[PDB]
Amino acid sequence: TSGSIINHANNLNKVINHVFADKPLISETMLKILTIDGTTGKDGYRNWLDKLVGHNYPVYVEPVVNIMNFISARFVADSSYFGYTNEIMIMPNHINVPVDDRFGFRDSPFCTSLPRTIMGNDVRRISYNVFSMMEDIDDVISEGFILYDAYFNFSYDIMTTDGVTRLKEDILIVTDTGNDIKPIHFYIYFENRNDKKLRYESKMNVSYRLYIKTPACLLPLSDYMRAQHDYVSPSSSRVYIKDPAVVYTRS
Amino acid sequence: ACRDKTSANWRGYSVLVSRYRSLIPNELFESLRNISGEYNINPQDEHSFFFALAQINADDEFIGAIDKESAEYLDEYATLARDISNSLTLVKAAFGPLER
Amino acid sequence: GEIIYDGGLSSKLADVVDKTTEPHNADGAVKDGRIAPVKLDLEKQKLDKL
Amino acid sequence: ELIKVPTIPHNLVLIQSDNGKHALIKEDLGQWPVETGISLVNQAGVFAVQLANKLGIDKPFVLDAGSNYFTDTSFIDTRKYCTDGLSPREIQKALNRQRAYYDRPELTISENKTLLSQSIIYPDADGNDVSIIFSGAMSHAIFTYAQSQWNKNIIKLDDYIREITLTVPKQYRPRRFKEIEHTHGYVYRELNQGSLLPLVDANLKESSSYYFKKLMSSISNV
Amino acid sequence: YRPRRFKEIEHTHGYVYRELNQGSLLPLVDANLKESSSYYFKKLMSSISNVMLTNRLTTANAPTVRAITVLT
């Protein structure tokens, strides 16, 4: 079918342009042997790459490939370590929320797990696309909801002092084209229980709150023994041969 | 040489044919299926076309799966058809039956 | 007496933009990596290039 | 050429309040902007290359953190205290401040000795050195996995000589090796042979012309 | 796809004129296009922007052969 050919041609052009920019991926000798026909060097490599589509040639998984695959898999799985989550929640300040109180943050935006049911009823879940397409966001925000089907990037600044925990920017932006969620930057402060000023400010000034799952990089000082880890280093008596050639030229 | 050149530069010509087909409307294409013709090409022209086959790239034209100029040119035909119908009705109402 | 609480910096949920905005994608917390919307000036009332 | 990494790349940061009542430990791997609507594995690999670059893991390497240790003043304590990772002195200070908030007494002498001896380097059966230190989970897992993957290609000199013993021509002179390089020699060499047949089969005449031209340019001057 | 919203006043008190005659291309299409087809072909190719035994080769007629290939 046409359109498939168009897509293949465009992808081939993008791949060739990207691989040939900066330091070329392919060595000079390979460029020479492909060019010896008379091509420009890019054309020969493009033709060879096209000829290799859907091959059955066996390939070897080098150690570097395994390392990258491991790191990528751990990046996909443990999302909290790299500053992005996959679901968030937005609810008014007047609705109580179970929170991770291990650290001691005041009005901590972290939950051990997102509440399945709140106040005896299930928490509504909305995809980001449907949420953006919406036009009655006020009614649905009057109760609060869990946004999912997107990768929400976030950041936080744990401040040593005590203060009101609030975001740098607003939670939501409404445009006639659609609705978006502004970048999330938490200003986390520690908690002193007996402070009427801060308690009143948190209760009255802030009207809506955003909750994300607790980052896995955060860990209390009390359970520091879990940070103990072992590393093995080979013996210092090993001597390394740079030139493992086993023979000398005759003269 | 001809085989290598043709195997290297066939995607571009296929895409060009696809775009050219996308330009034409459906009714005109159905009309053009009635006609027929034969093109005579000099041997030198054919051997030059296959010996020196220019490589055509349309990567800049396509934004993803959508190309603009083809859609624009195809859309203009709707305006042409509306004008045709309106003008025909106006002339028929203005002049009515015609005698020679 | 001392003033424990007197208003303060308030946080608002929504940033409503009055100016009409052209179609776009997500660029806040959620970033869309796909191609931006393609603007085509279709439906021309008068013929120009045909 | 193997690179000897002198220090373990921990990323632990201790954050404590001014009161000192609360304290926590954080792993700093940075924030990476991830997009939506595109596949996640591709972005994961693009970020994984940079993450490996950050940890000194991408290039082949071996660990050389055995010598980073000291010994205590007390004559009974012969243990080797490692100097890498989150130093136990920092955790001791944080815990002391936390107990200072609650009006509890400071850490006793016995508790101080228990805490300050947590990170240690001890020998292993085959001669390797195991260092126990405070470090994050992600760094530990990635570093250990990379160490294993790169160790898969380090082989003794005698084994390599045995592997390549069939291809040595008769006329050339054998190379003497120092006795140390025989008893304790190790070499990092990839031993998988990549087939050149894809290129040769795909474009046969280009490869044939190239090799024939080089061979005849060589032969013509005999 | 759904259309963008106009001003509120244009919604409560807004009126627009329109025509519902799509029209047909048959009067232009219905004819014997044998003689007039090649001029349309040339315009169609102009619509899309493009661009001893051996010394006898000349490339002065490439575009017309390319057009012939496309039409074929």
XYZ file of C-alpha atoms in Angstrom:
695
model
C 0.000 0.000 0.000
C 1.030 3.581 -0.619
C 1.577 5.695 2.464
C 3.581 2.760 3.746
C 6.164 3.540 1.059
C 5.984 7.229 1.994
C 6.518 6.411 5.668
C 9.433 4.103 4.860
C 11.109 6.726 2.670
C 10.732 9.443 5.304
C 12.065 7.194 8.070
C 15.010 6.178 5.885
C 15.874 9.820 5.217
C 15.629 10.688 8.916
C 17.832 7.740 9.908
C 20.483 8.556 7.297
C 20.560 12.238 8.240
C 20.842 11.470 11.950
C 23.527 8.789 11.685
C 25.715 10.844 9.352
C 25.638 14.001 11.495
C 28.393 14.890 13.999
C 30.763 11.897 14.233
C 29.652 9.425 11.535
C 28.435 6.115 12.918
C 30.126 4.141 10.144
C 33.892 3.803 9.827
C 35.870 5.324 6.970
C 36.877 1.974 5.449
C 33.229 0.932 5.147
C 32.429 4.257 3.493
C 35.302 3.618 1.075
C 34.119 0.137 0.117
C 30.531 1.345 -0.342
C 31.710 4.386 -2.333
C 34.094 2.503 -4.674
C 31.134 2.087 -7.031
C 30.864 5.868 -7.378
C 28.129 6.861 -4.941
C 28.258 9.816 -2.559
C 28.739 7.685 0.562
C 25.340 8.540 1.975
C 23.560 6.922 -0.974
C 25.519 3.678 -0.718
C 24.888 3.372 3.009
C 21.206 4.168 2.476
C 20.907 1.452 -0.171
C 22.707 -1.077 2.026
C 20.496 -0.234 5.009
C 17.377 -0.613 2.867
C 18.619 -3.982 1.606
C 19.017 -5.195 5.208
C 15.384 -4.608 6.226
C 13.804 -7.734 7.679
C 16.955 -9.854 7.749
C 17.501 -13.202 9.457
C 21.216 -12.778 10.177
C 22.133 -13.734 13.757
C 23.536 -10.997 15.979
C 25.422 -11.092 19.273
C 24.232 -9.277 22.401
C 27.326 -7.411 23.568
C 27.783 -6.488 27.252
C 27.074 -2.810 26.567
C 23.731 -3.695 24.978
C 22.796 -5.688 28.081
C 23.806 -2.798 30.352
C 21.694 -0.320 28.386
C 18.746 -2.727 28.350
C 19.005 -3.181 32.119
C 19.141 0.557 32.767
C 16.241 1.215 30.384
C 14.102 -1.491 31.997
C 14.796 -0.072 35.453
C 14.004 3.404 34.114
C 10.631 2.186 32.847
C 9.796 0.269 36.029
C 10.990 2.552 38.855
C 9.680 5.878 37.580
C 9.927 7.754 40.890
C 13.742 7.728 40.853
C 13.880 9.878 37.699
C 11.337 12.587 38.478
C 8.236 11.375 36.649
C 5.067 9.512 37.616
C 2.221 7.972 35.628
C -0.848 9.002 37.677
C -1.633 12.034 39.838
C -4.601 13.181 41.911
C -6.235 16.587 42.386
C -8.696 17.190 45.207
C -9.930 20.108 47.334
C -8.309 20.989 50.634
C -11.526 20.283 52.548
C -11.354 16.526 51.841
C -9.002 14.625 54.137
C -6.399 12.415 52.469
C -4.223 9.601 53.858
C -0.604 10.682 53.485
C 2.883 9.277 54.023
C 3.767 10.828 57.386
C 7.068 8.973 57.833
C 9.216 11.940 56.802
C 7.350 14.643 58.716
C 6.549 17.089 55.912
C 3.752 19.563 56.562
C 0.813 18.846 54.244
C 2.883 16.217 52.489
C 1.929 15.816 48.802
C 3.095 12.176 48.899
C 0.823 9.154 49.307
C 2.016 5.603 49.922
C -0.393 4.502 47.197
C -3.103 6.409 45.386
C -6.420 5.963 47.250
C -8.641 3.443 45.513
C -11.667 4.603 47.523
C -12.055 7.911 49.361
C -14.879 8.679 51.814
C -16.545 5.388 50.943
C -16.647 6.010 47.183
C -14.264 5.179 44.361
C -12.056 7.989 43.079
C -12.855 8.927 39.492
C -10.137 8.275 36.912
C -9.742 10.420 33.792
C -7.309 10.069 30.918
C -5.261 13.126 30.025
C -6.774 13.300 26.532
C -10.368 13.206 27.787
C -9.508 15.716 30.513
C -8.031 18.116 27.953
C -11.037 17.685 25.646
C -13.406 18.594 28.499
C -15.494 21.756 28.749
C -17.222 21.318 32.147
C -14.034 21.087 34.208
C -15.567 23.018 37.119
C -18.131 20.339 37.987
C -15.599 17.509 37.838
C -13.029 19.527 39.803
C -15.608 20.232 42.517
C -14.955 16.642 43.665
C -11.418 15.861 42.514
C -10.099 13.114 40.289
C -7.118 10.963 39.322
C -5.418 11.894 36.056
C -3.687 9.037 34.239
C -2.680 7.878 30.739
C 0.256 10.299 30.710
C 3.760 10.725 32.113
C 3.705 13.599 34.608
C 7.110 15.179 35.169
C 7.615 16.795 38.565
C 10.243 18.228 40.885
C 10.486 19.199 44.535
C 12.661 21.361 46.791
C 12.826 20.049 50.360
C 13.428 23.128 52.519
C 14.837 22.660 56.005
C 12.577 25.229 57.660
C 8.860 25.227 58.442
C 6.405 26.838 56.063
C 3.400 26.420 53.819
C 3.726 23.617 51.264
C 2.548 24.929 47.900
C 3.340 24.608 44.211
C 5.362 27.144 42.247
C 2.632 27.429 39.602
C -1.091 26.842 39.338
C -2.418 23.315 38.958
C -4.552 23.913 35.872
C -4.795 26.220 32.851
C -8.018 26.575 30.840
C -7.839 27.703 27.218
C -10.580 27.817 24.608
C -8.552 25.206 22.719
C -8.125 22.911 25.716
C -7.083 22.372 29.314
C -3.517 21.700 30.455
C -1.675 20.911 33.677
C 1.144 23.338 34.437
C 4.622 22.141 35.478
C 4.717 20.728 38.998
C 7.341 22.007 41.446
C 6.626 21.285 45.111
C 8.037 23.526 47.849
C 8.180 21.057 50.736
C 8.612 22.381 54.279
C 8.908 20.527 57.567
C 6.191 20.544 60.215
C 5.856 22.054 63.674
C 2.527 20.943 65.111
C 1.893 23.945 67.390
C 1.826 26.814 64.894
C -1.566 28.480 64.506
C -0.330 30.829 61.776
C 0.904 28.050 59.501
C -2.083 25.806 60.220
C -4.520 28.600 59.373
C -2.588 29.502 56.220
C -2.641 25.886 55.042
C -6.335 25.478 55.871
C -7.584 28.722 54.315
C -5.165 30.038 51.674
C -4.776 26.813 49.671
C -8.003 25.585 48.079
C -6.849 22.588 46.005
C -4.044 20.061 46.393
C -2.121 17.764 44.062
C -1.022 14.328 45.267
C 1.534 11.993 43.691
C 2.859 8.629 44.801
C 5.754 8.808 47.230
C 9.164 8.876 45.505
C 11.249 5.772 46.103
C 14.463 7.800 46.414
C 13.171 9.305 49.673
C 14.135 7.264 52.727
C 13.951 8.058 56.461
C 17.086 8.327 58.561
C 15.737 5.806 61.075
C 15.885 2.923 58.579
C 19.371 3.730 57.298
C 20.504 0.096 57.518
C 18.722 -0.551 54.217
C 21.281 1.692 52.499
C 24.085 -0.747 53.344
C 25.338 -2.380 50.153
C 28.335 -4.462 49.112
C 30.768 -4.008 46.219
C 33.393 -6.586 45.227
C 36.718 -5.578 43.686
C 39.150 -8.054 42.092
C 42.524 -8.866 43.584
C 45.266 -6.251 43.330
C 47.757 -8.967 42.328
C 46.314 -9.152 38.801
C 48.557 -7.766 36.053
C 46.966 -6.618 32.796
C 48.501 -7.272 29.372
C 47.929 -4.481 26.861
C 49.378 -6.413 23.896
C 48.356 -10.081 24.123
C 50.247 -11.012 20.959
C 51.964 -14.357 21.447
C 54.656 -14.065 18.763
C 57.308 -11.699 17.376
C 58.070 -10.647 13.818
C 61.037 -12.480 12.329
C 63.111 -9.345 11.716
C 24.587 0.362 -13.918
C 20.916 0.632 -14.897
C 19.865 -2.040 -12.396
C 21.789 -0.437 -9.533
C 20.420 3.016 -10.352
C 16.836 1.745 -10.578
C 17.103 -0.222 -7.331
C 18.520 2.841 -5.575
C 15.941 5.383 -6.755
C 12.558 3.638 -6.996
C 10.954 4.811 -3.740
C 11.160 8.444 -4.818
C 9.476 7.788 -8.151
C 6.794 5.669 -6.483
C 6.090 8.499 -4.029
C 5.996 10.975 -6.918
C 3.416 8.849 -8.732
C 1.399 8.649 -5.512
C 1.404 12.442 -5.150
C 0.462 12.962 -8.796
C -2.442 10.548 -8.390
C -3.461 12.420 -5.238
C -3.650 15.667 -7.224
C -6.372 14.462 -9.631
C -10.047 14.402 -8.572
C -12.161 11.279 -8.907
C -14.559 12.468 -11.620
C -11.756 13.659 -13.901
C -9.923 10.363 -13.401
C -13.046 8.417 -14.363
C -13.369 10.608 -17.454
C -9.731 9.993 -18.405
C -10.279 6.218 -18.338
C -12.211 6.455 -21.616
C -9.344 7.983 -23.625
C -6.240 6.128 -24.808
C -2.896 6.966 -26.370
C 0.594 5.761 -27.192
C 3.876 7.563 -26.493
C 6.871 7.188 -28.812
C 10.222 7.634 -27.043
C 13.540 7.914 -28.843
C 16.093 5.263 -27.799
C 18.613 7.927 -26.786
C 16.107 9.540 -24.420
C 15.329 6.198 -22.769
C 18.990 5.274 -22.349
C 19.735 8.725 -20.926
C 16.800 8.484 -18.515
C 17.987 5.116 -17.221
C 21.723 5.890 -17.338
C 21.375 9.174 -15.415
C 18.387 8.704 -13.107
C 18.040 11.705 -10.811
C 17.193 10.946 -7.185
C 14.019 12.738 -6.062
C 13.457 13.453 -2.365
C 10.104 14.610 -0.981
C 11.035 14.407 2.710
C 10.689 18.175 3.126
C 7.212 18.172 1.570
C 5.706 15.581 3.925
C 4.846 16.519 7.508
C 4.362 13.057 8.931
C 1.735 11.379 6.761
C 0.242 14.691 5.572
C 1.449 16.793 2.649
C -0.059 20.241 2.253
C 0.077 21.265 -1.405
C -1.665 18.119 -2.652
C -4.557 18.619 -0.230
C -4.833 22.295 -1.174
C -4.902 21.578 -4.905
C -7.453 18.802 -4.422
C -9.667 21.075 -2.315
C -9.729 23.814 -4.973
C -11.824 21.498 -7.175
C -14.796 21.793 -4.802
C -14.839 25.553 -5.366
C -14.545 24.928 -9.101
C -17.544 22.570 -9.072
C -19.667 24.979 -7.036
C -18.842 27.777 -9.477
C -19.704 25.529 -12.433
C -23.139 24.660 -11.065
C -23.953 28.241 -10.062
C -22.895 29.696 -13.418
C -24.844 27.076 -15.363
C -28.006 27.786 -13.374
C -27.603 31.544 -13.786
C -27.070 31.339 -17.554
C -30.011 28.971 -18.034
C -32.303 31.231 -16.005
C -31.074 34.341 -17.833
C -31.381 33.102 -21.422
C -33.735 30.113 -21.389
C -34.247 28.211 -24.638
C -31.948 29.247 -27.473
C -32.758 29.443 -31.181
C -30.445 29.676 -34.200
C -2.458 41.924 70.161
C -0.093 40.215 67.776
C -1.326 39.335 64.289
C -1.051 35.556 63.979
C -2.863 35.338 60.628
C -3.644 38.140 58.154
C -4.506 36.806 54.712
C -1.387 35.847 52.796
C -0.351 34.793 49.332
C -3.272 32.847 47.876
C -3.124 29.924 45.453
C -5.621 29.761 42.586
C -6.506 26.573 40.729
C -6.980 27.821 37.171
C -5.123 30.267 34.922
C -7.905 31.308 32.554
C -6.605 33.028 29.420
C -8.999 35.543 27.883
C -7.177 35.858 24.555
C -8.271 33.289 21.992
C -5.488 30.788 21.339
C -4.560 28.775 18.270
C -4.735 24.970 18.529
C -1.761 23.378 20.263
C -0.648 20.342 22.249
C 0.314 19.756 25.866
C 3.433 21.615 26.988
C 3.124 21.848 30.783
C 3.763 18.948 33.140
C 2.779 16.579 30.320
C 4.790 17.130 27.137
C 3.609 15.707 23.814
C 6.441 14.583 21.555
C 4.316 14.164 18.438
C 4.223 16.685 15.604
C 2.371 19.936 16.251
C -1.030 20.409 14.578
C -0.769 21.002 10.841
C -2.489 24.180 9.666
C -4.077 23.797 6.227
C -5.866 26.759 4.640
C -8.577 24.640 3.055
C -11.975 25.850 1.825
C -11.004 28.841 -0.287
C -13.994 30.925 -1.354
C -12.191 31.992 -4.546
C -9.869 29.993 -6.774
C -6.194 30.961 -6.672
C -3.922 28.093 -7.782
C -6.297 25.895 -9.822
C 42.213 -0.649 27.953
C 40.357 -1.277 31.203
C 39.675 1.730 33.424
C 40.246 1.262 37.151
C 37.478 3.071 39.042
C 38.979 4.319 42.337
C 35.731 5.282 44.109
C 32.221 3.849 44.339
C 29.704 6.290 42.758
C 27.174 6.696 45.552
C 24.485 9.372 45.314
C 23.171 9.594 48.879
C 22.276 13.036 50.241
C 21.226 13.590 53.861
C 18.544 16.253 54.396
C 17.759 17.324 57.960
C 15.562 20.052 59.415
C 16.870 23.023 61.371
C 15.121 21.657 64.457
C 16.760 18.310 63.737
C 13.595 16.387 64.609
C 13.270 14.960 61.089
C 15.932 13.609 58.753
C 15.924 11.671 55.501
C 18.227 10.227 52.842
C 17.735 10.808 49.121
C 19.142 9.334 45.920
C 20.058 11.968 43.326
C 19.880 10.611 39.781
C 18.468 13.781 38.213
C 15.213 14.631 36.472
C 14.798 13.454 32.876
C 12.013 14.972 30.722
C 9.829 12.147 29.399
C 7.314 12.779 26.615
C 3.911 11.242 25.933
C 2.438 9.814 22.755
C 5.810 8.312 21.807
C 7.187 4.920 22.796
C 8.775 4.786 26.241
C 11.491 2.189 25.590
C 13.262 4.395 23.035
C 13.384 7.356 25.415
C 14.456 4.949 28.153
C 17.462 3.875 26.098
C 18.337 7.452 25.149
C 18.336 8.359 28.843
C 20.130 5.130 29.796
C 23.157 6.041 27.688
C 23.462 9.333 29.579
C 22.874 7.612 32.922
C 25.695 5.158 32.211
C 27.902 8.099 31.229
C 27.039 9.763 34.548
C 28.030 6.731 36.633
C 31.273 5.915 34.807
C 29.811 2.595 33.694
C 29.464 2.755 29.910
C 33.129 2.232 29.080
C 34.781 -1.062 30.109
C 36.138 -0.875 33.632
C 37.218 -2.743 36.749
C 36.837 -1.712 40.382
C 39.874 -0.579 42.390
C 38.311 0.572 45.668
C 40.115 -1.931 47.893
C 42.842 0.446 49.075
C 40.390 3.131 50.292
C 40.502 2.214 53.966
C 41.997 3.183 57.312
C 42.446 1.546 60.720
C 41.218 2.592 64.154
C 43.400 3.862 66.984
C 42.285 1.114 69.377
C 44.605 -1.891 69.342
C 41.867 -4.551 69.382
C 40.136 -3.128 66.293
C 42.035 -4.544 63.317
C 39.070 -3.925 61.005
C 39.580 -1.910 57.822
C 37.160 1.024 57.767
C 36.284 1.982 54.197
C 36.200 5.666 53.281
C 33.695 5.462 50.407
C 29.948 5.981 50.410
C 27.961 8.003 52.905
C 30.396 8.460 55.769
C 29.079 7.110 59.098
C 30.178 10.376 60.727
C 27.421 12.253 58.878
C 24.771 9.779 60.025
C 26.194 9.961 63.551
C 25.889 13.756 63.558
C 22.343 13.639 62.185
C 21.258 11.060 64.766
C 22.897 13.098 67.527
C 20.945 16.186 66.461
C 17.727 14.153 66.294
C 18.294 12.910 69.842
C 19.195 16.461 70.869
C 15.731 17.623 69.817
C 13.931 14.984 71.899
C 16.078 15.780 74.984
C 17.446 12.237 74.777
C 21.093 11.680 75.719
C 23.642 11.601 72.932
C 24.838 8.338 71.419
C 26.906 6.371 73.912
C 30.454 5.153 73.324
C 29.314 1.617 72.484
C 26.657 2.880 70.067
C 29.218 5.183 68.448
C 31.584 2.254 67.906
C 28.713 0.180 66.514
C 27.725 2.882 64.020
C 31.181 4.056 62.918
C 32.271 0.502 61.993
C 29.397 -0.261 59.608
C 31.345 0.458 56.404
C 34.196 -2.044 56.167
C 36.479 -3.752 53.650
C 37.200 -7.435 54.146
C 39.012 -10.023 52.021
C 37.124 -12.749 50.192
C 38.075 -16.401 49.727
C 39.626 -16.012 46.268
C 41.415 -12.736 47.072
C 38.767 -10.193 46.104
C 37.946 -7.334 48.471
C 34.342 -6.765 49.564
C 33.499 -3.226 50.688
C 30.253 -2.611 52.580
C 29.201 1.046 52.413
C 26.105 3.235 52.491
C 24.775 3.678 48.955
C 21.546 3.913 47.015
C 19.652 0.997 45.533
C 19.690 2.059 41.877
C 23.401 2.872 41.827
C 24.203 -0.400 43.599
C 22.157 -2.527 41.196
C 23.403 -0.823 38.032
C 27.049 -0.839 39.133
C 26.953 -4.515 40.128
C 25.234 -5.555 36.894
C 27.730 -3.602 34.793
C 30.607 -5.113 36.762
C 29.335 -8.618 36.012
C 28.739 -7.895 32.325
C 32.233 -6.464 31.868
C 33.793 -9.265 33.936
C 32.303 -11.711 31.436
C 35.069 -10.701 28.982
C 38.143 -10.701 31.268
C 40.064 -13.958 30.856
C 43.412 -15.305 32.001
C 46.372 -14.975 29.654
C 46.882 -18.735 29.380
C 43.269 -19.276 28.309
C 43.555 -16.604 25.612
C 46.827 -18.093 24.354
C 45.115 -21.485 24.216
C 42.211 -19.999 22.262
C 44.452 -18.337 19.660
C 47.092 -21.090 19.548
C 45.818 -22.638 16.303
C 46.319 -19.527 14.164
C 49.982 -18.773 14.961
C 52.153 -19.282 11.852
C 55.274 -21.410 12.037
C 57.938 -18.951 10.879
C 57.426 -16.200 13.466
C 59.356 -16.144 16.793
C 57.538 -16.995 20.054
C 57.260 -14.192 22.595
C 58.562 -14.820 26.098
C 56.278 -13.704 28.920
C 57.258 -12.680 32.425
C 56.365 -15.277 35.044
C 53.981 -12.804 36.697
C 52.048 -12.411 33.447
C 51.684 -16.200 33.417
C 50.638 -16.667 37.044
C 48.554 -13.476 37.359
C 47.989 -12.262 33.793
C 44.515 -11.141 32.753
C 43.378 -9.760 29.389
C 40.182 -8.002 28.296
C 39.356 -9.184 24.775
C 36.077 -9.724 22.960
C 36.118 -13.204 21.440
C 32.964 -13.214 19.295
C 33.627 -13.005 15.557
C 31.220 -10.885 13.531
C 30.420 -12.315 10.120
C 31.318 -10.091 7.173
C 28.961 -12.004 4.878
C 26.052 -9.475 5.041
C 28.051 -6.734 3.309
C 29.721 -9.154 0.894
C 26.405 -10.703 -0.147
C 24.442 -7.447 -0.365
C 26.918 -5.553 -2.592
C 29.183 -8.221 -4.049
C 30.933 -6.305 -6.816
C 31.964 -3.349 -4.629
C 33.616 -5.593 -2.038
C 35.196 -7.752 -4.736
C 36.628 -4.696 -6.492
C 37.985 -3.219 -3.254
C 39.708 -6.394 -2.074
C 41.043 -7.252 -5.537
C 42.473 -3.756 -5.994
C 44.228 -3.855 -2.622
C 45.588 -7.360 -3.213
C 46.923 -6.535 -6.676
C 48.459 -3.249 -5.531
C 50.287 -5.378 -2.966
C 51.322 -8.171 -5.339
C 52.529 -5.985 -8.219
C 55.717 -4.956 -6.367
C 57.194 -8.418 -5.753
C -12.643 17.351 15.810
C -15.050 20.001 17.066
C -15.065 23.706 16.171
C -13.769 26.469 18.406
C -16.201 28.693 20.286
C -16.904 32.232 19.099
C -17.609 35.230 21.317
C -20.573 35.054 23.681
C -22.388 37.896 21.909
C -21.845 36.141 18.577
C -23.449 33.066 20.147
C -26.533 34.692 21.666
C -27.214 37.164 18.830
C -25.115 35.839 15.937
C -26.447 35.124 12.458
C -24.533 33.803 9.453
C -25.394 33.436 5.773
C -24.563 30.207 3.970
C -25.241 28.161 0.855
C -25.850 24.418 0.675
C -25.178 23.730 -3.032
C -22.158 21.438 -3.255
C -22.307 21.285 -7.052
C -21.013 18.716 -9.507
C -17.992 18.458 -11.798
C -19.809 16.521 -14.533
C -20.215 19.399 -17.062
C -16.450 19.914 -17.091
C -15.749 16.178 -16.873
C -18.274 14.989 -19.481
C -16.548 15.566 -22.836
C -14.200 13.934 -25.336
C -10.919 14.793 -23.616
C -8.672 13.061 -26.165
C -7.220 16.287 -27.569
C -7.238 18.306 -24.332
C -5.777 15.649 -22.020
C -2.106 16.383 -22.699
C -2.303 20.061 -21.720
C -3.886 18.978 -18.439
C -1.080 16.442 -18.055
C 1.557 19.149 -18.479
C -0.199 21.375 -15.950
C -0.403 18.434 -13.537
C 3.341 17.814 -13.755
C 3.993 21.539 -13.332
C 1.858 21.522 -10.170
C 4.449 19.525 -8.179
C 7.888 21.121 -7.909
C 10.763 18.841 -8.921
C 14.516 19.478 -9.055
C 33.107 6.466 -26.996
C 29.918 4.522 -26.307
C 29.023 6.975 -23.510
C 29.808 10.412 -24.978
C 26.753 10.125 -27.249
C 24.427 10.331 -24.226
C 22.537 13.603 -23.733
C 20.082 14.513 -20.964
C 18.134 17.332 -22.625
C 14.804 15.439 -22.635
C 14.673 13.974 -19.114
C 11.580 15.817 -17.742
C 9.257 14.689 -20.533
C 10.384 11.073 -20.131
C 9.785 11.345 -16.383
C 6.285 12.672 -17.060
C 5.684 9.806 -19.493
C 6.821 7.303 -16.857
C 4.473 8.803 -14.262
C 1.511 8.791 -16.652
C 2.232 5.206 -17.712
